[PDB]
Design a protein around this ligand. Structure first.
Ligand SMILES: c1ccc(-c2cn3c(n2)CCC3)cc1
Ligand code: NA
Length: 305
């Protein structure tokens, strides 16, 4: 319909510091969370029930991502490394070493033989999952990298940075295929492809989300009304029910927008600190949200449409 009706079903407590990142497993069974407390935690996606803790990093974790078969995780940490984890055993399979500063963002490609990472050292790196060795280092940006993401077939990587740029990279060659600039260049705090791979969603620290057609290099939609001036907040395409845009906010709310009309259709209340991360369940109308230091909780919300 024209409004979803997301309601709080579960609150997940257990991280002892700010939560940084939540992600649903591709098979829809699990939620993974990462924290400034150096831990990864696994939860049931439908019941919110705590499953296990995965540890190893020497400093806080900024991001976590699932392999396509839901069996592996990769995490990105202030200790300048990434780790690949076997979720079932908790074993750390590889430690990816190479970045010279905080690793801030990470993702598998759809085939999940590659990982891409972004760092405070202003580079983007492409790693081989099986050997744990860095395949490419891209001179991507002139300020920290805030997000990295593979498109639907893994041929392209999008990156964003505080330098105000979104860039598109050819995975196989490492060549910069495109630089997106608008009328102005505020810091870009987040970026990711649309599910079909034709568009790019980009967040800027001027309280604004933009939908880009990247092939034509034009900005199509603009989403506002939330607060985002300081933090790198995840955003999502909601595609299981109504077609929405979902994002956290520095006023402690989860914002949901009609993707077409750009109107705010729902604002979720409940967190007590900045909502830094949101995720959308692959098959059900479920949203996971997570908050910073004064809150430390993850919330699971359910809608009928
Ligand atoms: C604290 C911790 C993590 C974060 C964060 C991590 N990533 C993003 N934001 C966007 C992409 C990855 C922001 C603040
Ligand atoms: Na953001």
């Amino acid at each position: 319909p024209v409004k979803p009706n997301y309601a709080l079903k579960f609150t997940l407590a257990g991280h002892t510091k700010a939560v940084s990142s939540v992600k649903f497993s591709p098979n829809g069974e699990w939620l993974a969370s990462s924290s400034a407390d150096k831990l990864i935690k696994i939860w049931g996606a439908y019941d919110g029930k705590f499953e296990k803790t995965i540890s190893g990093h020497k400093l806080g974790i900024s991001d976590v991502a699932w392999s396509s078969d839901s069996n592996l995780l990769v995490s990105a940490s202030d200790d300048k490394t990434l780790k690949i984890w076997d979720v079932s055993s908790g074993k750390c399979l590889k430690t990816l070493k190479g970045h010279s500063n905080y690793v801030f963002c990470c993702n598998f490609n759809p085939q999940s033989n590659l990982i891409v990472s972004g760092s405070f050292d202003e580079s983007v790196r492409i790693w081989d999952v099986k050997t744990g060795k860095c395949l490419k280092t891209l001179p991507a940006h002139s300020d920290p990298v805030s997000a990295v993401h593979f498109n639907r077939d893994g041929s392209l990587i999008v990156s964003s940075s505080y330098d105000g740029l979104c860039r598109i990279w050819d995975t196989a060659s490492g060549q910069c295929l495109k630089t997106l600039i608008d009328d102005d260049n505020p810091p870009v705090s987040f970026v990711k492809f649309s599910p079909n791979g034709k568009y790019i969603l980009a967040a800027t620290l001027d309280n604004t989300l933009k939908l880009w057609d990247y092939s034509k290099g034009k900005c199509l939609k603009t989403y506002t009304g939330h607060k985002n001036e300081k933090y790198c907040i995840f955003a999502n395409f909601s595609v299981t029910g109504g077609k929405w845009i979902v994002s956290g906010s520095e006023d402690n709310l989860v914002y949901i927008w009609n993707l077409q009309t750009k109107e705010i259709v729902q604002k979720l209340q409940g967190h007590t600190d900045v909502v830094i991360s949101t995720a959308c369940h692959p098959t059900e109308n479920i949203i996971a949200s997570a908050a910073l230091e004064n809150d430390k909780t993850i919330k699971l919300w359910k809608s009928d449409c």
